Symmetry: C2
Subunit: 869 residues, 2 copies
């Protein structure tokens, strides 16, 4: 039992049950704010629907109807009465807020007969029909039978037919004429089924519709792209209806107590007088700035304002609130902690902090570590813009600089490769359908929409760029072109930015606010994990160090063998036939490589850098085109056959588990020796010239057995030893390993007899545990996602149930043999907030991710600790 | 009495007496650090010298000699004894540290005979002569008889003559041979006077030399450019000498506990083994990084390190310290709170703050508000550099991007217009002589020098850019060319930056650290004054608002009449012959102007903006070339004579006190009316479209009598009233005034019967009080400075003794009539830290300066309050 809850029986805490919205709805109810009373149908009832083979149970169905009875008795009106019906609103609400994805139906409980009783119990026909026409429209759209296409094409004609141009211009007539039509499209767009006239059939079908929505393709991809588990489920709230379309002194609007896009503090929002919330303000007819309501309805402003703050103060954070004035009566519909843009989050955080509302601890815990990627977005180059063709101006929805080939559909924006293929989504407006092409674009361009529009809203969440409500664009898919200022475009290349302008540009680099830095700072007081980066070069090293990297967890050495001015040596080593020649071949590189390490060691100023031995199998080193093989042979005296034949010798079926990594060192110790000399000579010298202590870290890859690490460790040590023949350094160095094979995790305690430290290469540990190659997975990963087999991408988010197990028991065991054993992570999982919290709990010492993910990890680790203490 | 103090009888507090250095010297003495004992000759003794018509009094002279006796008895050696003399060091020390300006003499107490006693009491001849040769050199340079020219030209020859290349390569022979020579140049470079051989004559002449230095041209300009009052005076410290040139296990070096140029934390510094401090490390022979001493003399490193920190912890801030190892014995010579670069200051501030050493209150008080100008320095454009000709690499002394025409002398860098004429000072090394061309350049380029070099040092203070120790440059004034990489230059155009590189560039814009922002923030918690800006445009307004401007204190309206698409209207107004035509002329502008205010009012989002009425006299509006006058006439039907004759009518002898400002409004009310309409229509409309409250601020300039403000106030009000005929607004507006005339300050209490607020235009108040025109002053201001009549520039630093009086009594009186009267400042004095503290104490409400000075004022006002509470 308890599939339904009243608002009066909740709080912010039952978010889980009550969905985010619903607990808030409850929470405000308890606060005493003017909200239309109602009930929420539990998230567990969603779950329930789903388990119960998509059937609304007796227990529930009943339970809802029961709640409905309470409403009627609650407020004199009877649910669907003939002359004085109850019309409620239906709005889905999952546990975690999520923009442009929520299903909303207003005026539900209206039909062919009640529209009249309603018109009589009101004296306002235009009102009744207007609502009725809207509801027929929503329900069949949300409840999806038919789509907004053939609706807007009707209210549209009617406006032209009538010459009168605002929907708000139609009469109690046209409105019934219009409701005549719509209700005609519902059945066309149906099994010829005539629109349900039974309130009860309507209510169930809405509650139902929602649930059935929560497993929709689109939601699923949104739940993925948003790291949300699809076993949560939406709640369905039902509320008594307030009418924003009652007429001239009625209205609805969305507001936010701080700029959702700048954090900048003070009321922000839009609205429309005499209009319906859930549809109207969020789109078309140019909504007015909530600040203007001061003008229009000053006694509501004061009130609404006082209340918005009462909120913010209440939830200690910026609020996103839907409200309605019904004939001079304001109502709150729903509050939500506003979805912000990264910079905005940072800003509100500092502010609430400085203002005294929240501690730094909460400021830290409240940022979505994953969004900092937003701050490091290449901005626009000044003289680039300065000297740029401004062909447009509009709404600065979500901040940023966009620039890329314009496309007229998600369906094709997407197709042109996700969010990085420099694509601009050009649309009249967007919708949940669009969700994917949006995520894929540099920024979204809309023809019609406010700050509260769907796109403004979604982008800001996704931190994509957005310029909305650009009237002046003349779009046409049929030609797939648009017009602005004087230029015509056809999937061309467009460029824009949040700060209004859109033009016919060079992107450059961040330059992070100080809110970012105080954030980054408070992070640093709480974070236990250190944060090294993954860099192979000094610039990259410089960048991270600047983002706050505390060293290097993965310096890869392949480029030291790849670069042209080095390649042939390895190629000689490969093609060579004797250890003496091979050795020698190698020898030549020492100098080029020792130089690399030097610049590295110099850049770091004494911060650790984990150097990773030669990784790929040799094949990667030879040339596969017999044009280049022909070269090589010339330059070697071999024959084209001598070469290719040797190449073909190096060829492997499953290169991911061939002969590479340490396997190479067991057979070609020379490498480990040459590598060690390069390394050691370098640090000793830099130690010489600077006076800075260096303590080299050598990491042997692909180790699956102790005895196999010991072999290579021996070879390394002898040389690291033989190198202290400058000053016998007595440079201390560390030999550790990559745990990227499951045997290694299984045998960690032994791996640890020889390894001074463990570096988790989750990227490979992942492909091994799962048994699937990254390169090849995608031919099926999608169907995996589509089919809910996998909610998360396993190469981007640490599989904590399998992969995190191996990692976990490797820490536990490596530490049985070596208690002060240092562990680190170095996959992409390092800049993965979740993974980080994992590594934090699991006991790792440091994490490691790209120069850019650093701030992410930093934040993340602070949370990890705050969360887990 | 008390012209001399021992170190043991002081502390950091007597800085005033004891000079900065000396109190520190004392302070460390008291701490128990290894410092050669000594005495300081008071700053008041400097004063004393000067007042007493440049004579070292009996009282003093005696007093010094007495202190000297104490030394001898202090440490077995006798001052100038024949076989075991006392050689001391002499180093000037004023009350406020100041780079590249301090006079230093080491080994003083040596002569023709003692060099031997010294060589015998030592067994080290090369040592004795080496010192002796250095001292003959310093003294005659510092004590200035002769200059480093003909010295380095001698040790130079000797090196070549001897083929041996390091001075450290000369023998106990060459050294006496060399001392033979030097001592020969002293008398050449003299009244044929043979170098004083009397310790006592030497000691006095040094103490003397110093004092006489403190009124040197150069110091004076440095004291100006550094806001230091020349009535302070240097102290002269005398200390027992420690020898860094004793040989291979001796040395000297300068260090700093945090990068003086990045704030970046951890020991930074340079040094030379067997070398003299004060001369050697700071220049030529490539000094080693203080971190390398770990290598060389590890038991000293530990010690020196422990002590450096003991310091920092002691003075709660980064330390600049001179030290010497004498045969494995480390000594501290002097500590000083290091002079930093802006960014470095910010950084150390946050850090000491976060580390727990200092409060935010001190972090704020410790920045030199005047240096923030450094952060807003146009940086380098990425693709500009990215795609730039790197012809050089060297030391990143003082951070920055320099770019400008290269010059081989201050004497000509200067000449090419000060620090903004895009000039690069190209030098082998620099010196106090150079001080001015340095201050004038975009950055300094040196051929030889370390981090601790003179230039590195000076620039960092002046926050000029600096790339030092560029061996590879081949310089020649004789052709005035240099060579780098492969290009030859001749006063060309060079570009560089602190981050090493120097190339054959586009500058762009700041992007302030977050240390800047937390700074800027703590500032904001303490500052009482609000900070509006001075902007006439929206971009400028946008920038300030972004730097933290809290409105506009001065929106100038001339550009609204100047712009081409507007000029003729004012010209018609001028040339017109009837109020009706004039009125009309005016009328046409209303629209162009109302638009200006609108964009303004929109940019501000409801922040105040003080609008300033028409200022200049009309003449500025007509054309003075009879080519343009000919145009105008055509376009007016007038004759060329009709026009010029009218122009000549507008001509005035002293345009600064002609008919302009409000005088115009008394005679041409139309302006005030047109201005008021523009303004009011604009704010009402913007108030309409946004819903944001606007509360216009109208400021009438050049008001010198109440009855005269009342006249224009009347006219304004009637119109502001007649404008509320849209919605009778009941927009509230404010009429206030500019106090820029002394009558106004004298009659403020009455001015206040009509003025809602006072805006101090110190720029004009200054030219009026002083009686001198800015434009014309410079023909004598310099001689004023040169002659010490004026230590500060009165148009850049508020004259608090005269001009601040008028301001001050205007607040006091305006407030006798209008208690809640708001006062504000709006000259350049607004971004003048000192002025700000003044306005803070005086009682102003807000200050106002350019978009860029804002952060300055912000900081400043926080200090103003912290200081004065």
């Amino acid at each position: 039992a308890k599939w339904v809850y009243k608002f009066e029986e909740g709080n912010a805490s039952m978010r889980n049950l009550l969905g985010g919205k619903g607990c808030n709805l409850a929470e405000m109810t308890i606060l005493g704010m003017p909200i239309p009373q109602g009930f929420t149908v539990t998230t567990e009832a969603c779950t329930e629907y789903y388990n119960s083979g998509k059937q609304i149970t007796q227990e529930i169905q009943d339970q809802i109807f029961e709640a409905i009875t309470w409403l009627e008795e609650l407020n004199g009106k009877k649910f669907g009465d003939t002359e004085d019906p109850l019309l409620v609103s239906v709005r889905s609400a999952a546990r975690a807020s999520m923009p442009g994805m929520m299903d909303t139906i207003l005026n539900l409980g209206l039909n062919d007969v009640a529209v009249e009783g309603f018109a009589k119990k009101t004296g306002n026909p235009r009102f009744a029909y207007d609502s009725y026409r809207r509801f027929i429209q929503m329900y069949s759209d949300v409840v999806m039978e038919v789509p907004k296409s053939h609706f807007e094409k009707i209210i549209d004609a009617m406006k032209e037919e009538k010459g009168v141009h605002f929907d708000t211009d139609l009469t109690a007539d046209d409105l019934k004429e219009l409701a005549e039509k719509f209700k005609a499209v519902y059945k066309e767009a149906m099994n010829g089924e005539e629109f349900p006239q039974e309130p009860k059939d309507q209510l169930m079908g809405a509650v139902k519709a929602v649930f059935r929505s929560w497993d929709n393709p689109r939601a699923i991809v949104y739940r993925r792209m948003n790291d949300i588990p699809g076993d949560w489920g939406t709640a369905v709230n039902v509320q008594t209806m307030v009418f924003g379309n009652k007429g001239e002194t009625s209205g609805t609007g969305v507001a936010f107590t701080r700029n959702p896009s700048t954090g900048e503090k003070g009321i922000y929002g839009e609205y429309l007088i005499n209009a319906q919330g859930e549809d109207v303000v969020a789109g078309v007819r140019t909504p007015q700035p909530i600040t203007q309501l001061e003008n229009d309805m000053p006694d509501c402003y004061k009130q609404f304002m006082d209340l918005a703050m009462k909120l913010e103060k209440h939830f200690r954070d910026m609020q996103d609130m839907e409200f309605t004035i019904e004939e001079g009566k304001l109502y709150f519909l729903q509050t939500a902690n506003g979805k912000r843009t990264a910079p905005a989050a940072l800003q509100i955080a500092c502010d609430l902090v400085d203002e005294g509302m929240i501690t730094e601890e909460e400021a830290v815990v409240r940022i979505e570590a994953k969004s900092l990627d937003q701050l490091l977005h290449p901005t626009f180059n000044p003289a680039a813009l300065k000297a740029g063709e401004v062909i447009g101006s509009a709404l600065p929805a979500s901040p940023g600089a966009a620039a890329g080939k314009v496309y007229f559909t998600a369906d094709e924006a997407k197709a042109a490769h996700e969010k990085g293929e420099r694509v601009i989504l050009v649309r009249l407006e967007t919708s949940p359908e669009d969700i994917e092409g949006m995520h894929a674009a540099e920024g979204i361009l809309t023809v019609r929409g406010g700050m509260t529009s769907h796109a403004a809203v979604v982008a800001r969440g996704m931190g994509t760029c957005c310029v909305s409500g650009c009237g002046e664009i003349k779009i046409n898919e049929e030609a797939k072109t648009f017009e602005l200022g004087g230029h015509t475009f056809a999937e061309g290349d467009y460029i824009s930015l949040d700060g209004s302008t859109g033009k016919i540009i060079e992107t450059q680099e961040a330059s992070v606010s100080g809110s970012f830095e105080r954030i980054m700072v408070w992070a640093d007081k709480f974070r236990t994990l250190k944060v090294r980066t993954n860099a192979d070069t000094p610039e990259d090293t410089l960048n991270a160090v600047k983002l706050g990297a505390e060293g290097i967890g993965l310096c890869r050495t392949e480029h030291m063998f790849f670069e042209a001015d080095r390649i042939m040596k390895i190629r000689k080593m490969i093609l060579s036939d004797s250890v003496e020649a091979r050795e020698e071949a190698l020898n030549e590189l020492i100098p080029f490589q020792k130089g690399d390490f030097k610049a590295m060691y110099k850049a770091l100023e004494g911060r650790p850098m984990t150097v990773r031995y030669l990784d790929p199998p040799l094949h990667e080193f030879v040339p596969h085109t017999e044009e280049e093989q022909a070269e090589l042979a010339k330059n070697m005296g071999l024959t084209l056959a001598e070469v290719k034949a040797k190449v073909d010798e190096l060829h492997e079926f499953n290169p991911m588990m061939g002969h590479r990594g340490c396997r190479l060192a067991v057979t070609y110790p020379e490498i480990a020796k040459m590598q060690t000399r390069a390394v050691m000579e370098a640090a000793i010298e830099v130690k010489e010239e600077t006076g800075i202590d260096i303590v080299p870290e050598i990491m042997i890859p692909l180790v699956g057995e102790k005895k196999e690490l010991k072999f290579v460790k021996d070879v390394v040590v002898e040389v690291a030893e033989q190198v202290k023949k400058e000053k016998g350094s007595d440079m201390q160095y560390h030999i550790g390993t990559m745990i990227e094979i499951p045997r290694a995790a299984l045998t960690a305690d032994a791996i640890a007899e020889e390894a001074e430290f463990f570096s988790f290469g989750t990227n490979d540990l992942t492909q091994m545990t799962f048994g699937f190659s990254r390169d090849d997975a995608g031919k099926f990963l999608d169907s995996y996602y589509k089919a809910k087999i996998y909610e998360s991408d396993p190469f981007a988010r640490l599989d904590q149930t399998g992969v995190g197990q191996l990692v976990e028991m490797a820490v536990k065991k490596g530490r049985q043999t070596r208690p002060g054993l240092k562990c680190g992570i170095c996959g992409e999982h390092g800049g993965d907030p979740s993974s980080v919290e994992f590594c934090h709990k699991v006991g790792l010492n440091y994490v490691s991710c790209s120069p850019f993910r650093v701030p992410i990890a930093r934040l993340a680790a602070a949370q990890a600790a705050l969360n887990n203490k």
